[PDB]
Amino acid sequence: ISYAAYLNVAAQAIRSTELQTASVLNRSQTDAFYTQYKNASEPTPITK
Protein backbone atom coordinates (compact mmCIF):
# COMPACT_ATOMS: atom_id res chain seq x y z
CA ILE A 1 0.00 0.00 0.00
CA SER A 2 1.42 3.34 -1.20
CA TYR A 3 1.32 6.56 0.87
CA ALA A 4 -1.37 8.01 -1.42
CA ALA A 5 -3.44 4.83 -0.94
CA TYR A 6 -2.84 4.90 2.83
CA LEU A 7 -4.21 8.46 2.74
CA ASN A 8 -7.22 7.41 0.67
CA VAL A 9 -8.32 4.77 3.21
CA ALA A 10 -8.15 7.39 5.99
CA ALA A 11 -9.81 10.00 3.74
CA GLN A 12 -12.61 7.61 2.72
CA ALA A 13 -13.08 6.36 6.28
CA ILE A 14 -13.43 10.08 7.09
CA ARG A 15 -16.42 9.45 4.82
CA SER A 16 -17.50 5.85 5.54
CA THR A 17 -25.87 9.49 6.69
CA GLU A 18 -26.01 13.24 6.08
CA LEU A 19 -22.99 15.48 5.55
CA GLN A 20 -22.54 12.55 3.13
CA THR A 21 -23.66 14.49 0.04
CA ALA A 22 -23.57 13.58 -3.70
CA SER A 23 -20.03 14.63 -4.66
CA VAL A 24 -18.87 13.20 -1.29
CA LEU A 25 -20.18 9.70 -2.07
CA ASN A 26 -18.96 10.12 -5.68
CA ARG A 27 -15.44 10.70 -4.38
CA SER A 28 -15.65 7.28 -2.65
CA GLN A 29 -16.62 5.63 -5.98
CA THR A 30 -14.33 5.21 -9.01
CA ASP A 31 -15.49 3.66 -12.31
CA ALA A 32 -11.89 3.23 -13.47
CA PHE A 33 -10.35 0.02 -14.84
CA TYR A 34 -6.72 -0.78 -15.60
CA THR A 35 -5.40 -2.82 -18.51
CA GLN A 36 -1.73 -3.74 -18.91
CA TYR A 37 -0.19 -3.58 -22.41
CA LYS A 38 2.61 -5.50 -24.20
CA ASN A 39 4.10 -6.17 -27.67
CA ALA A 40 -0.20 -3.85 -28.77
CA SER A 41 -2.33 -6.53 -27.06
CA GLU A 42 -2.92 -6.73 -23.28
CA PRO A 43 -3.09 -8.55 -19.87
CA THR A 44 -6.92 -8.80 -19.41
CA PRO A 45 -8.77 -5.76 -17.81
CA ILE A 46 -9.32 -5.41 -14.04
CA THR A 47 -10.98 -2.94 -11.64
CA LYS A 48 -8.79 -0.39 -9.81
Next chain:
Amino acid sequence: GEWFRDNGKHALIVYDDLSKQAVAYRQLSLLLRRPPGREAYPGDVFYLHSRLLERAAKLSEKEGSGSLTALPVIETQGGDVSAYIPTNVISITDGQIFLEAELFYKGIRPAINVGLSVSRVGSAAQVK
Protein backbone atom coordinates in the same frame (compact mmCIF):
# COMPACT_ATOMS: atom_id res chain seq x y z
CA GLY B 1 -37.01 -19.96 -74.16
CA GLU B 2 -40.11 -22.09 -73.54
CA TRP B 3 -39.22 -24.49 -76.35
CA PHE B 4 -36.25 -25.63 -74.24
CA ARG B 5 -38.38 -25.79 -71.04
CA ASP B 6 -41.19 -27.63 -72.83
CA ASN B 7 -38.79 -30.18 -74.36
CA GLY B 8 -36.80 -31.25 -71.31
CA LYS B 9 -33.94 -28.78 -71.64
CA HIS B 10 -33.05 -25.67 -69.65
CA ALA B 11 -33.02 -22.09 -70.77
CA LEU B 12 -32.12 -18.89 -68.95
CA ILE B 13 -33.79 -15.67 -70.10
CA VAL B 14 -32.61 -12.12 -69.37
CA TYR B 15 -35.10 -9.28 -69.88
CA ASP B 16 -32.85 -6.25 -70.20
CA ASP B 17 -34.74 -4.26 -69.28
CA LEU B 18 -38.41 -4.27 -68.25
CA SER B 19 -38.26 -0.63 -67.16
CA LYS B 20 -38.05 0.25 -70.85
CA GLN B 21 -40.68 -2.30 -71.90
CA ALA B 22 -43.29 -0.66 -69.62
CA VAL B 23 -42.45 2.75 -71.12
CA ALA B 24 -43.21 1.35 -74.58
CA TYR B 25 -46.40 -0.26 -73.37
CA ARG B 26 -47.47 3.12 -72.05
CA GLN B 27 -46.86 4.69 -75.48
CA LEU B 28 -49.13 2.14 -77.24
CA SER B 29 -51.88 2.77 -74.68
CA LEU B 30 -51.73 6.53 -74.65
CA LEU B 31 -51.85 6.80 -78.46
CA LEU B 32 -54.58 4.15 -78.68
CA ARG B 33 -56.32 6.53 -76.24
CA ARG B 34 -56.79 3.99 -73.46
CA PRO B 35 -57.38 6.26 -70.45
CA PRO B 36 -54.21 6.07 -68.36
CA GLY B 37 -53.55 5.20 -64.73
CA ARG B 38 -50.75 6.06 -62.28
CA GLU B 39 -47.73 7.95 -63.75
CA ALA B 40 -49.64 7.69 -67.09
CA TYR B 41 -49.08 3.92 -67.34
CA PRO B 42 -51.91 1.54 -68.23
CA GLY B 43 -53.99 0.34 -65.28
CA ASP B 44 -52.75 -3.21 -65.92
CA VAL B 45 -49.02 -2.42 -66.24
CA PHE B 46 -48.42 -4.89 -63.39
CA TYR B 47 -50.18 -7.69 -65.28
CA LEU B 48 -47.94 -6.88 -68.27
CA HIS B 49 -44.97 -8.17 -66.30
CA SER B 50 -46.71 -10.58 -63.95
CA ARG B 51 -47.95 -12.82 -66.75
CA LEU B 52 -44.54 -12.65 -68.48
CA LEU B 53 -42.51 -13.72 -65.45
CA GLU B 54 -45.01 -16.41 -64.44
CA ARG B 55 -43.93 -18.22 -67.61
CA ALA B 56 -40.50 -18.93 -66.13
CA ALA B 57 -40.88 -22.20 -64.28
CA LYS B 58 -39.59 -25.64 -63.39
CA LEU B 59 -41.86 -28.20 -65.04
CA SER B 60 -43.03 -31.49 -63.50
CA GLU B 61 -41.75 -34.98 -64.38
CA LYS B 62 -44.87 -35.79 -66.48
CA GLU B 63 -43.73 -32.77 -68.50
CA GLY B 64 -40.06 -33.80 -68.81
CA SER B 65 -38.52 -31.73 -65.98
CA GLY B 66 -37.52 -28.83 -68.32
CA SER B 67 -37.12 -25.29 -66.94
CA LEU B 68 -37.07 -21.58 -67.81
CA THR B 69 -35.22 -19.25 -65.46
CA ALA B 70 -35.75 -15.51 -65.69
CA LEU B 71 -33.39 -12.69 -64.81
CA PRO B 72 -35.38 -9.49 -65.42
CA VAL B 73 -33.57 -6.20 -65.06
CA ILE B 74 -35.17 -3.10 -63.60
CA GLU B 75 -33.86 0.47 -63.54
CA THR B 76 -34.42 2.80 -60.57
CA GLN B 77 -33.91 6.54 -60.44
CA GLY B 78 -31.82 7.86 -57.56
CA GLY B 79 -32.06 4.60 -55.64
CA ASP B 80 -35.88 4.86 -55.51
CA VAL B 81 -36.83 1.18 -55.18
CA SER B 82 -40.12 2.49 -53.86
CA ALA B 83 -41.02 3.80 -57.30
CA TYR B 84 -44.12 2.45 -59.09
CA ILE B 85 -42.78 -0.13 -61.60
CA PRO B 86 -39.91 -1.25 -59.32
CA THR B 87 -42.49 -2.07 -56.63
CA ASN B 88 -44.53 -4.23 -59.08
CA VAL B 89 -41.70 -6.43 -60.30
CA ILE B 90 -40.23 -6.90 -56.81
CA SER B 91 -43.57 -8.42 -55.82
CA ILE B 92 -43.46 -10.65 -58.91
CA THR B 93 -39.99 -12.24 -58.66
CA ASP B 94 -38.59 -14.84 -56.20
CA GLY B 95 -35.86 -12.56 -54.81
CA GLN B 96 -33.70 -9.62 -55.86
CA ILE B 97 -30.08 -8.75 -56.47
CA PHE B 98 -29.70 -5.08 -55.47
CA LEU B 99 -26.85 -3.03 -56.91
CA GLU B 100 -25.66 0.22 -55.36
CA ALA B 101 -23.45 2.92 -56.89
CA GLU B 102 -22.24 3.75 -53.39
CA LEU B 103 -20.89 0.21 -53.16
CA PHE B 104 -19.50 0.29 -56.71
CA TYR B 105 -17.28 3.20 -55.70
CA LYS B 106 -16.20 1.78 -52.34
CA GLY B 107 -14.62 -0.97 -54.44
CA ILE B 108 -17.41 -3.47 -53.87
CA ARG B 109 -18.09 -5.14 -57.25
CA PRO B 110 -20.48 -6.71 -58.05
CA ALA B 111 -22.08 -3.84 -56.11
CA ILE B 112 -24.47 -6.20 -54.31
CA ASN B 113 -26.31 -4.99 -51.27
CA VAL B 114 -26.36 -8.12 -49.10
CA GLY B 115 -28.74 -6.57 -46.56
CA LEU B 116 -31.41 -6.03 -49.20
CA SER B 117 -30.63 -8.95 -51.52
CA VAL B 118 -32.47 -12.28 -51.18
CA SER B 119 -33.15 -15.43 -53.20
CA ARG B 120 -36.32 -16.96 -51.81
CA VAL B 121 -35.62 -20.40 -53.28
CA GLY B 122 -32.79 -20.29 -50.70
CA SER B 123 -30.36 -23.15 -50.14
CA ALA B 124 -32.61 -25.54 -52.11
CA ALA B 125 -30.82 -24.49 -55.32
CA GLN B 126 -27.27 -24.11 -53.99
CA VAL B 127 -24.48 -26.69 -54.26
CA LYS B 128 -24.30 -28.53 -50.90
Next chain:
Amino acid sequence: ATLKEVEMRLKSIKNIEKITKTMKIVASTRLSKAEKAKISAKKMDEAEQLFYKNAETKNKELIVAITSDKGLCGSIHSQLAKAVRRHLNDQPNADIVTIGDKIKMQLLRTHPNNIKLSINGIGKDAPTFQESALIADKLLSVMKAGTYPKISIFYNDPVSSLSFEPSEKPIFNAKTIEQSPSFGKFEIDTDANVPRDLFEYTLANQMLTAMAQGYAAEISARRNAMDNASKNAGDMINRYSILYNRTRQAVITNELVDTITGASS
Protein backbone atom coordinates in the same frame (compact mmCIF):
# COMPACT_ATOMS: atom_id res chain seq x y z
CA ALA C 1 -35.48 13.17 -53.78
CA THR C 2 -38.74 11.55 -52.61
CA LEU C 3 -40.87 13.11 -49.85
CA LYS C 4 -40.55 9.91 -47.79
CA GLU C 5 -36.72 10.12 -48.04
CA VAL C 6 -36.56 13.86 -47.27
CA GLU C 7 -39.01 13.31 -44.39
CA MET C 8 -36.67 10.96 -42.54
CA ARG C 9 -33.41 12.84 -43.22
CA LEU C 10 -34.98 16.11 -42.03
CA LYS C 11 -36.37 14.41 -38.94
CA SER C 12 -33.04 12.65 -38.22
CA ILE C 13 -31.10 15.95 -38.04
CA LYS C 14 -33.98 17.57 -36.15
CA ASN C 15 -32.89 15.14 -33.40
CA ILE C 16 -29.08 15.46 -33.72
CA GLU C 17 -29.63 19.23 -33.37
CA LYS C 18 -31.79 18.83 -30.22
CA ILE C 19 -29.24 16.25 -29.04
CA THR C 20 -26.11 18.40 -29.48
CA LYS C 21 -27.90 21.36 -27.88
CA THR C 22 -28.92 19.28 -24.85
CA MET C 23 -25.28 18.24 -24.57
CA LYS C 24 -24.29 21.93 -24.86
CA ILE C 25 -26.34 22.90 -21.80
CA VAL C 26 -25.22 19.73 -19.96
CA ALA C 27 -21.73 21.09 -20.62
CA SER C 28 -22.45 24.66 -19.43
CA THR C 29 -23.98 23.22 -16.22
CA ARG C 30 -20.97 20.93 -15.67
CA LEU C 31 -18.72 24.02 -16.06
CA SER C 32 -19.67 25.57 -12.70
CA LYS C 33 -18.57 22.20 -11.33
CA ALA C 34 -15.42 22.55 -13.48
CA GLU C 35 -13.97 25.73 -11.93
CA LYS C 36 -14.70 24.38 -8.43
CA ALA C 37 -12.35 21.61 -9.57
CA LYS C 38 -9.84 23.71 -11.52
CA ILE C 39 -9.34 26.65 -9.13
CA SER C 40 -9.47 24.31 -6.10
CA ALA C 41 -6.64 22.30 -7.70
CA LYS C 42 -4.65 25.26 -9.02
CA LYS C 43 -4.50 26.64 -5.47
CA MET C 44 -3.42 23.23 -4.16
CA ASP C 45 -0.95 23.56 -7.03
CA GLU C 46 0.73 26.72 -5.72
CA ALA C 47 1.06 25.25 -2.22
CA GLU C 48 2.20 21.72 -3.11
CA GLN C 49 4.53 22.90 -5.90
CA LEU C 50 6.12 25.75 -3.90
CA PHE C 51 8.24 23.45 -1.72
CA TYR C 52 10.01 22.24 -4.85
CA LYS C 53 10.77 25.77 -6.14
CA ASN C 54 12.48 26.76 -2.88
CA ALA C 55 14.37 23.48 -2.46
CA GLU C 56 15.30 23.99 -6.18
CA THR C 57 14.47 20.42 -7.21
CA LYS C 58 15.64 19.40 -10.69
CA ASN C 59 16.58 16.11 -12.45
CA LYS C 60 14.32 5.16 -19.53
CA GLU C 61 11.54 7.70 -18.86
CA LEU C 62 7.88 7.29 -17.88
CA ILE C 63 5.22 9.30 -19.73
CA VAL C 64 1.71 9.63 -18.34
CA ALA C 65 -0.71 11.03 -20.94
CA ILE C 66 -4.04 12.43 -19.70
CA THR C 67 -7.28 13.03 -21.56
CA SER C 68 -10.47 10.95 -21.49
CA ASP C 69 -12.73 8.23 -22.95
CA LYS C 70 -15.22 10.56 -24.62
CA GLY C 71 -15.21 12.25 -28.03
CA LEU C 72 -17.23 15.25 -29.24
CA CYS C 73 -14.84 17.76 -27.68
CA GLY C 74 -12.90 19.40 -30.51
CA SER C 75 -9.20 18.60 -30.87
CA ILE C 76 -8.59 17.77 -27.17
CA HIS C 77 -7.08 14.32 -27.74
CA SER C 78 -5.64 15.12 -31.16
CA GLN C 79 -3.23 17.90 -30.27
CA LEU C 80 -2.34 16.50 -26.84
CA ALA C 81 -1.20 13.31 -28.54
CA LYS C 82 0.67 15.68 -30.88
CA ALA C 83 2.55 17.20 -27.93
CA VAL C 84 3.47 13.75 -26.60
CA ARG C 85 4.63 12.67 -30.08
CA ARG C 86 6.71 15.83 -30.54
CA HIS C 87 8.33 15.08 -27.18
CA LEU C 88 8.69 11.39 -28.02
CA ASN C 89 11.28 11.95 -30.78
CA ASP C 90 13.80 13.35 -28.28
CA GLN C 91 13.59 9.98 -26.49
CA PRO C 92 11.80 7.15 -28.34
CA ASN C 93 12.56 4.62 -25.59
CA ALA C 94 9.94 6.08 -23.22
CA ASP C 95 7.34 3.95 -21.42
CA ILE C 96 3.79 5.30 -21.85
CA VAL C 97 0.85 5.09 -19.46
CA THR C 98 -2.41 6.35 -20.92
CA ILE C 99 -5.27 7.82 -18.91
CA GLY C 100 -8.26 7.80 -21.25
CA ASP C 101 -9.04 5.62 -24.24
CA LYS C 102 -9.21 8.32 -26.89
CA ILE C 103 -5.57 9.23 -26.16
CA LYS C 104 -4.65 5.55 -25.96
CA MET C 105 -6.17 5.08 -29.44
CA GLN C 106 -4.17 8.05 -30.77
CA LEU C 107 -0.80 6.83 -29.46
CA LEU C 108 -1.56 3.20 -30.34
CA ARG C 109 -1.72 4.22 -34.00
CA THR C 110 1.79 5.68 -33.74
CA HIS C 111 3.76 4.18 -30.82
CA PRO C 112 2.09 0.86 -29.82
CA ASN C 113 5.18 -0.75 -28.24
CA ASN C 114 5.74 2.23 -25.89
CA ILE C 115 2.34 1.78 -24.18
CA LYS C 116 2.49 -0.45 -21.09
CA LEU C 117 -0.64 0.48 -19.11
CA SER C 118 -4.02 2.00 -19.95
CA ILE C 119 -6.43 3.56 -17.47
CA ASN C 120 -10.06 3.32 -18.48
CA GLY C 121 -13.57 4.68 -17.85
CA ILE C 122 -12.44 8.14 -16.82
CA GLY C 123 -14.28 11.00 -18.58
CA LYS C 124 -17.57 10.62 -16.66
CA ASP C 125 -17.57 12.32 -13.22
CA ALA C 126 -14.91 14.89 -12.27
CA PRO C 127 -11.51 13.49 -11.22
CA THR C 128 -11.17 12.49 -7.58
CA PHE C 129 -8.18 11.77 -5.34
CA GLN C 130 -9.21 8.13 -5.18
CA GLU C 131 -8.81 7.57 -8.91
CA SER C 132 -5.69 9.71 -8.76
CA ALA C 133 -4.29 7.67 -5.84
CA LEU C 134 -5.28 4.24 -7.10
CA ILE C 135 -3.78 4.90 -10.53
CA ALA C 136 -0.68 6.08 -8.64
CA ASP C 137 -0.74 2.83 -6.68
CA LYS C 138 -0.77 0.91 -9.97
CA LEU C 139 2.13 2.91 -11.42
CA LEU C 140 4.27 2.25 -8.33
CA SER C 141 3.43 -1.48 -8.46
CA VAL C 142 2.92 -2.63 -12.05
CA MET C 143 5.02 0.04 -13.80
CA LYS C 144 7.57 0.09 -10.94
CA ALA C 145 7.40 3.89 -11.34
CA GLY C 146 9.81 4.76 -8.47
CA THR C 147 12.79 3.55 -10.51
CA TYR C 148 12.55 5.87 -13.57
CA PRO C 149 14.89 8.90 -13.45
CA LYS C 150 12.27 10.83 -15.44
CA ILE C 151 8.45 10.96 -15.02
CA SER C 152 6.25 13.31 -17.09
CA ILE C 153 2.57 14.31 -16.94
CA PHE C 154 0.95 15.55 -20.18
CA TYR C 155 -2.44 17.15 -19.86
CA ASN C 156 -4.45 20.05 -21.32
CA ASP C 157 -4.20 23.44 -19.63
CA PRO C 158 -7.35 25.58 -19.88
CA VAL C 159 -6.20 29.17 -20.48
CA SER C 160 -9.88 30.16 -20.97
CA SER C 161 -13.28 28.72 -22.04
CA LEU C 162 -12.49 29.49 -25.71
CA SER C 163 -9.16 27.63 -26.15
CA PHE C 164 -6.79 25.30 -24.23
CA GLU C 165 -3.05 24.53 -24.14
CA PRO C 166 -1.39 21.06 -24.26
CA SER C 167 1.07 21.06 -21.35
CA GLU C 168 3.75 19.03 -19.56
CA LYS C 169 5.12 18.81 -16.01
CA PRO C 170 7.65 16.60 -14.19
CA ILE C 171 7.29 14.33 -11.14
CA PHE C 172 10.51 13.89 -9.13
CA ASN C 173 11.39 10.60 -7.42
CA ALA C 174 12.87 10.14 -3.90
CA LYS C 175 16.50 10.22 -5.05
CA THR C 176 15.99 13.58 -6.86
CA ILE C 177 14.07 15.17 -3.96
CA GLU C 178 16.82 14.22 -1.48
CA GLN C 179 19.69 15.42 -3.64
CA SER C 180 18.15 18.79 -4.60
CA PRO C 181 20.33 21.97 -4.20
CA SER C 182 18.32 23.60 -1.41
CA PHE C 183 16.91 20.45 0.24
CA GLY C 184 19.02 21.47 3.22
CA LYS C 185 17.19 24.77 3.54
CA PHE C 186 14.53 22.78 5.41
CA GLU C 187 14.79 21.14 8.82
CA ILE C 188 13.56 17.77 7.58
CA ASP C 189 13.62 14.95 10.12
CA THR C 190 16.24 12.64 8.53
CA ASP C 191 14.37 9.56 9.86
CA ALA C 192 11.33 7.80 8.27
CA ASN C 193 11.71 8.36 4.50
CA VAL C 194 10.07 11.75 3.85
CA PRO C 195 11.35 12.05 0.25
CA ARG C 196 9.69 8.66 -0.35
CA ASP C 197 6.35 9.85 0.97
CA LEU C 198 6.64 13.29 -0.60
CA PHE C 199 7.21 11.59 -3.97
CA GLU C 200 4.32 9.11 -3.74
CA TYR C 201 1.97 11.80 -2.47
CA THR C 202 3.03 14.25 -5.19
CA LEU C 203 2.62 11.47 -7.76
CA ALA C 204 -1.08 11.21 -6.92
CA ASN C 205 -1.57 14.96 -6.28
CA GLN C 206 -0.03 16.42 -9.45
CA MET C 207 -1.84 13.77 -11.44
CA LEU C 208 -5.11 14.98 -9.95
CA THR C 209 -4.09 18.58 -10.57
CA ALA C 210 -3.47 17.58 -14.19
CA MET C 211 -6.69 15.61 -14.56
CA ALA C 212 -8.65 18.43 -12.90
CA GLN C 213 -7.35 20.95 -15.44
CA GLY C 214 -7.66 18.55 -18.40
CA TYR C 215 -11.23 17.87 -17.33
CA ALA C 216 -12.01 21.59 -17.21
CA ALA C 217 -10.33 22.02 -20.59
CA GLU C 218 -12.41 19.20 -22.11
CA ILE C 219 -15.81 20.34 -20.76
CA SER C 220 -15.13 23.83 -22.18
CA ALA C 221 -14.11 22.29 -25.53
CA ARG C 222 -17.09 19.90 -25.68
CA ARG C 223 -19.35 22.87 -25.01
CA ASN C 224 -17.84 24.91 -27.87
CA ALA C 225 -17.94 21.77 -30.03
CA MET C 226 -21.66 21.11 -29.38
CA ASP C 227 -22.32 24.84 -29.83
CA ASN C 228 -21.19 24.71 -33.49
CA ALA C 229 -22.68 21.26 -34.06
CA SER C 230 -26.00 22.75 -32.97
CA LYS C 231 -25.31 25.77 -35.14
CA ASN C 232 -24.62 23.66 -38.24
CA ALA C 233 -27.24 21.04 -37.40
CA GLY C 234 -29.75 23.88 -37.13
CA ASP C 235 -28.55 25.56 -40.34
CA MET C 236 -28.93 22.27 -42.23
CA ILE C 237 -32.45 21.93 -40.85
CA ASN C 238 -33.40 25.18 -42.61
CA ARG C 239 -32.10 23.99 -45.99
CA TYR C 240 -33.83 20.62 -45.64
CA SER C 241 -37.15 22.09 -44.52
CA ILE C 242 -37.03 24.31 -47.59
CA LEU C 243 -36.35 21.17 -49.72
CA TYR C 244 -39.20 19.37 -47.92
CA ASN C 245 -41.73 22.05 -48.77
CA ARG C 246 -40.78 22.00 -52.44
CA THR C 247 -41.10 18.20 -52.47
CA ARG C 248 -44.42 18.30 -50.57
CA GLN C 249 -45.84 20.85 -53.05
CA ALA C 250 -44.50 18.77 -55.94
CA VAL C 251 -46.25 15.62 -54.68
CA ILE C 252 -49.61 17.44 -54.57
CA THR C 253 -49.17 18.87 -58.10
CA ASN C 254 -48.13 15.53 -59.63
CA GLU C 255 -51.00 13.55 -58.08
CA LEU C 256 -53.33 16.29 -59.24
CA VAL C 257 -51.97 16.00 -62.80
CA ASP C 258 -52.56 12.18 -62.95
CA THR C 259 -56.11 12.75 -61.74
CA ILE C 260 -56.70 15.53 -64.25
CA THR C 261 -55.17 13.52 -67.11
CA GLY C 262 -57.38 10.55 -66.10
CA ALA C 263 -60.58 12.62 -66.13
CA SER C 264 -59.60 14.36 -69.42
CA SER C 265 -60.74 11.48 -71.63
